[PDB]
Amino acid sequence: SFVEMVDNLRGKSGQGYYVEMTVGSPPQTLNILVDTGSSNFAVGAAPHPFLHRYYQRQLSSTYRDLRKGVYVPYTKWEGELGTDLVSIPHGPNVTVRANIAAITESDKFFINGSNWEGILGLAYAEIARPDDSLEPFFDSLVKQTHVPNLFSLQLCGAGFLASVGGSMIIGGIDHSLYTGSLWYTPIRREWYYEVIIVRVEINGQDLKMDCKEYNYDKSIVDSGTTNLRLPKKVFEAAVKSIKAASSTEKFPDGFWLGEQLVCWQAGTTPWNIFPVISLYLMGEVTNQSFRITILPQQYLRPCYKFAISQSSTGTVMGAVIMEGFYVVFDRARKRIGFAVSACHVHDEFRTAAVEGPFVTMEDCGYN
């Protein structure tokens, strides 16, 4: 019953959504970031100033050492590979033996005060560390249980660091979580959750770009990223258009750079000054697409910060984008569904939307 998975997610604004999990025998309780942007089940397994709890392998009778290290530098974290029994108390009623990367040392990986101690990489083996032979959690879950190869995310944010809530429905779609129709965009390739954006408008105004630019060098849906992140050329075009629309009110550049914050007081925020943003995603039929339309309430995150920023690794549809909608990761049919969320924030003049069809290319993909 999905009803027991409702509101199984919590977090702090800007610091991700986490679900409660247990690992080991007896069960060790840990909060684990839901991350569709990576593919490793990786959990703090040694003391760290930002961790108040951590996985203690020696306390687990069901821990098995894989005798294999793993080192992941970026911008880092290193750990030791093992397997153990994992459950999600407010998830499916099963227990699976899953790969676990036990993080023993890290640098700028954990977040102070996030309240989570590990990461649940929900993307595909191709991008797993150290390599694609380390079966991701969800793969193990499906193989080991009768849980359908699908999960869905309703991220709700805060609404009026702020506390956020949401739901991760594993193995199905909870119709109470959304209104209207679900529209599906193909998963272009099973590594990240890669999709194709075929067009984008700001307040109805088409950015008029070669659609390859929207997916340069790729477009992904990533719960583990807070912001809508856009390729350099698309970002600049987006900000320009947004600056203009909100002209009647000038802000510091630091704000547009996602650095400085902008403040009003108690429901005086002039939301109407900021334009909506429509992302058209490739449909299940070639020259057919649909749009998801987001409000300023989504891309101005709480005083507010500009939750749109520049990317050098392609477009990233992160939390603030997912927060408007109910997002279905239909792995079984290689597609991602979008519908209007039951919990999305909106005012009395505009509302987040998912609408289709809109006729438009397979040539929007950037190899």
* Chain residues in the site for ligand X17 (CB under 6 A): 16, 33, 35, 37-38, 40, 42, 72, 74, 109, 119, 121, 129, 222, 224-225
Report d(CA 83, CA 247) in Å as an integer: 55
SS3 366: coil
Residues 90-113, buried b or exposed e (16+ Cβ, 10 A)?
bbbeebbebbbbbbbebeebbeee
Contact 96, 144 (CB under 8 A): yes
Shortest reach from residue 41's CB to ligand X17, in Å: 9
Q: Which is nearer to ligand X17, 119 or 198 (CB)?
A: 119
In 173-215, DSSP assigns E strands to 178-186, 194-195, 197-202, 205-206
Q: Which is nearer to ligand X17, 42 or 339 (CB)?
A: 42
Residue type, 327: V
Q: If you ran DSSP here, which 8-state letter would residue 306 be given?
A: E
Cα dihedral 61/62/66/69 (nearest 10): -60
Tokens coding 232:
């350099």
CA separation (Å) from 218 to 30, 118, 127, 210, 213?
A: 33, 26, 14, 14, 9
Shortest reach from residue 30's CB to ligand X17, in Å: 14
Tokens coding 292:
């998801």
Q: Whose CB is nearest to ligand X17?
A: 37
**7, 35, 107, 132: which one is catalytic?**
35
Respond yes or no: is residue 131 known to be catalytic.
no
Q: State the residue for tokens 């997002």.
A: 327
Shortest reach from residue 298's CB to ligand X17, in Å: 18
Q: Which is nearer to ligand X17, 167 or 227 (CB)?
A: 227
Tokens coding 158:
């805060």
Respond yes or no: is residue 174 known to be catalytic.
no
**84, 139, 174, 222: which one is catalytic?**
222
Q: Which is nearer to ligand X17, 110 or 178 (CB)?
A: 110
Shortest reach from residue 143's CB to ligand X17, in Å: 21
Q: Which is nearer to ligand X17, 39 or 298 (CB)?
A: 39
Contact 194, 123 (CB under 8 A): no
Contact 366, 292 (CB under 8 A): no
Report d(CA 128, CA 110) in Å as an integer: 19
Shortest reach from residue 42's CB to ligand X17, in Å: 6
Tokens coding 68:
């294999």
Shortest reach from residue 111's CB to ligand X17, in Å: 7
Contact 186, 180 (CB under 8 A): no
Tokens coding 184:
């599906």
Shortest reach from residue 31's CB to ligand X17, in Å: 12
Report d(CA 132, CA 213) in Å as an integer: 29
Report d(CA 158, CA 311) in Å as an integer: 25
Q: Which is nearer to ligand X17, 174 or 222 (CB)?
A: 222
Q: Which is nearer to ligand X17, 6 or 123 (CB)?
A: 123
Q: What is the 3-state secondary structure (H, E, C) of 51-97?
A: CCCCCCHHHCCCCEEEEEEEEECCCCEEEEEEEEEEECCCCCCCCEE
Q: Residues with catalytic annotation?
A: 35, 222
